[PDB]
Amino acid sequence: LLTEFRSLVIKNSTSRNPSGINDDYGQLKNFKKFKKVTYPGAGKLPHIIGGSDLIAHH
Amino acid sequence: STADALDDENTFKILVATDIHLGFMEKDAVRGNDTFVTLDEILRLAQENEVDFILLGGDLFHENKPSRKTLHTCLELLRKYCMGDRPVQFEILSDQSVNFGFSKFPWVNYQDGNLNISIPVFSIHGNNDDPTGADALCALDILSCAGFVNHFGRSMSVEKIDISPVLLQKGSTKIALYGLGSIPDERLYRMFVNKKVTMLRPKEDENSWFNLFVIHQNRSKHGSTNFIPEQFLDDFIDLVIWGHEHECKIAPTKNEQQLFYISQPGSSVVTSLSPGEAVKKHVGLLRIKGRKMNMHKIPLHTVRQFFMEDIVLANHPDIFNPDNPKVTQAIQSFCLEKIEEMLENAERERLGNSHQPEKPLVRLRVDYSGGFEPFSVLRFSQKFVDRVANPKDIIHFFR
Amino acid sequence: TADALDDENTFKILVATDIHLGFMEKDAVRGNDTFVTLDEILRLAQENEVDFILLGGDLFHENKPSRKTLHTCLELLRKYCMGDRPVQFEILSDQSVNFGFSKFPWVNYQDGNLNISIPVFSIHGNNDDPTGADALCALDILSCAGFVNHFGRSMSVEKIDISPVLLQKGSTKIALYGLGSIPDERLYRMFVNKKVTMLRPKEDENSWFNLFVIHQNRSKHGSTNFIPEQFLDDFIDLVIWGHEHECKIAPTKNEQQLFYISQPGSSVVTSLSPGEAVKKHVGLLRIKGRKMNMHKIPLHTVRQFFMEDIVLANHPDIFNPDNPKVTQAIQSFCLEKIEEMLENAERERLGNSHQPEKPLVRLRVDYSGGFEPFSVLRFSQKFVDRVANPKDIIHFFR
Ligand SMILES: [Mn+2]
Ligand SMILES: [Mn+2]
Ligand SMILES: [Mn+2]
Ligand SMILES: [Mn+2]
Predict the structure, then answer these.
(1) In this complex, do A56 and C87 lie within 8 Å of one another by their Cβ atoms?
(2) Which domains does chain C have, with CATH numbers?
């Protein structure tokens, strides 16, 4: 059973603080770090200019 | 159910698959999409079961240099499914940089601040896709740099190998994942002989690490050192994902001598017409809780069906008489009947599966020992051109 | 003036083309130059808070890029495109029409899964045009990755409808017309047959800055082996000609068609030609209302190229065809010229550490008049460790 043993838990002088997300149930366990950023028009009906809105140039 | 209770905050749900050989026979007219559709099905199953993460056994791309279409299809599928919003409820305790040193972004994909990873993909490069070139790069490197697949288990040094683990913790459960990329069998055998293989273990909570190992090496012995004996590995390893062997034995099996289990998920596509390939393909959902484990095999509904049968003419002297001038005609008749029965079974099975491919694969192995003469395979196969996926490989004569 | 132009209603576009990424990769001396230049341009983009890059095509030199080339391209794009910088402009066109061939038909950043900070728009240049029954190109791979939005594809070859992508930021708006590279003769025939059309928005028709990128030969290399500028219509405001590698990034007014044409030129010296000699640049094109402003920025990592032609017949005093030693005098003069070239190269290099150490050289010699060429290899031996292309330092022609 015994083999090479090396302290692998990554704890520096200050132990690593796991990341989290708003607690949806109890204390939700999330460690992701993605947050899609907003762009203009977000949450707004798109003002799309297509189909008949475009005209061939004569 | 018992499985539902076993699905808790402290239970890992690892989906296991191997040897997708994506893009295999891509240029084929009939089998062209088999690999792609199979990958779609496996990823969809991963999503539906809400798996904590995927652990692919290697050989992800059939060719060492995947063709453009293959890479595009794989990448779009991964982006479509594995990118999402469902929370990931496990955390990494190891030194990520050590595990993924060869990547300029040394951290697990879902920890990237810019990618919305939902279903992280872990894998280990297989024989067909091992790093190559002076740069020593592989397709999994392309995907990883793109930010989809976490490529782990790389070997920094050829003289000596230090298989460091990635420590995955979910609640009270912890896992030590030990992956060893595909290495040529003779060399790895010799290195094991020379005591050049070492496995690091965490000094902390030593007994509390379900030691999970993955390898891509031949399991059967085809030569003096043209394989890897199980006896080499140590008993502290809890579960082993033997991947390279395409035949499926997904059911975990205990090694009495070594006291650890060995799982052979097998290929996700029938790359060859061999008896091992005939077994129904499956993909394993592994559950880990504490020091215990459980494996549940899931059928694939898109894997093109393979039916094989070995017929020995000499074992039917009543039916086959070599002296009989018309023995060849009777042989053809019986082979035709057997192939009809195989197709009947294939259609019967397919009836319940819509997505299943329509034309299954069939190979009849004929032992013509005893003076029996093989006949024109081409002319016989002419009659099943529209029925089977291997019209040119319906029968096989051997002695 | 530039600061005043830099407003919430002002676009900030970085334009470059013919990156020819990875070309001559395997070489020891210039192998890494392409990646260094790509890093330089991306870093310039990220430093000047550019709204979006508009690569003119040929983003990969080889139709099927090498594993290393693709890996490094993805690496750099990840390091310098993904971030927390918000994108401050908006799409107004119907997206699926433009990126329909992708299973995710929308501008990459509009996808929720990816944190794009600096969008990349491009077209497909000749060397990386779609090929195979699948009609996919490396830029399609990057698109699927969600890094580069490959726009301007043409579904049919018999008819072409260049649907613009409409981009607005504050008050200012842009119509971006991207026509991918096409075989020149075929495109010429299509223009002659009136099969070419460029759709326009009915709304505020005159308020849309019509910007049209194209990758085609400019100079007349044949009867129909190029694209006369007269084919374009005057409603187009600015044209970014991409294929030609001579850098002419200074906008030029064509008195006839009343449209500006800017030629960013390649970012790396692919071939030894006089046009390649000019110093390369990258344009921080700005747009506001119907007025535009292009400001060039030199690249500190493009391998230096010095070129000069020498007509021996033009120096009768120095060289006499009847002189038996004429070969040696010619060789001495060539050595002196090359030494002066190297001196100037080092002089200019001294001001930028990043610049490549071994400058490139190509000396064209017009040996007409009964003169004979001398050994190229023997003469070039003296600089094998001094110039980046020692095997071809001199060119003899008549
Ligand atoms: Mn395999
Ligand atoms: Mn294998
Ligand atoms: Mn070019
Ligand atoms: Mn070109």
Answers:
(1) no
(2) 2-298 (3.60.21.10), 305-397 (3.30.110.110)
